[PDB]
Design a protein around this nucleic acid. Sequence first.
DNA 1: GCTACCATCG
DNA 2: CGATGGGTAGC
Length: 205
Amino acid sequence: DSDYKRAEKHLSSIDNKWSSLVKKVGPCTLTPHPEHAPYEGIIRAITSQKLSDAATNSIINKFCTQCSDNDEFPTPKQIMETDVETLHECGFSKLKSQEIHIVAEAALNKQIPSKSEIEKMSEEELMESLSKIKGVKRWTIEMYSIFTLGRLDIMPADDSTLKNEAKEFFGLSSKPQTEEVEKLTKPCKPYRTIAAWYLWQIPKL
DNA sequence: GCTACCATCG
DNA sequence: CGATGGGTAGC
């Protein structure tokens, strides 16, 4: 809460457009879930690939409802006891079903960095480490860093939607390349996650 | 009523 | 290459 206040004040100290956007959108309501284990955050991030928040939620809901006896997130063991065929019925694509099964195996076999180690890793180190997982690359690791880890300076410059918002926000003539979004949002440090969140709220206006 | 909107695999 | 998951905003 205090972090967001500070972030909001910083974003309101850059050029005029950031100040205006923050005022119109209001307080940042981003709610990460660092209590989630790495395998859960990773699976949630994989599921969201190419899908809206609502679509992703309906899939995870079925997943938790069917593959869990307490409606909580399925444990690695439970996921392992489920064949890809059944996972696909939940709404996971066939490819994602395979990847999620592998992530579950990895968690069970202690092949995924522990949450403790993940917390000591810089984003660059997290990228190098988690990118070793099939189905997990830049975008997915950024989402995991934002929505699970709660990191505050993550700019998912490669996000298609954010790029569309950046085009409008910065008054660009064409959808910007990832490198360009990175350059334009530099002033937002060290709260680029919050800056991204605000850009993501532009449609809701 | 329509339908556009991550990362992997033969 | 060309498929791929699904709720829903914009038409």
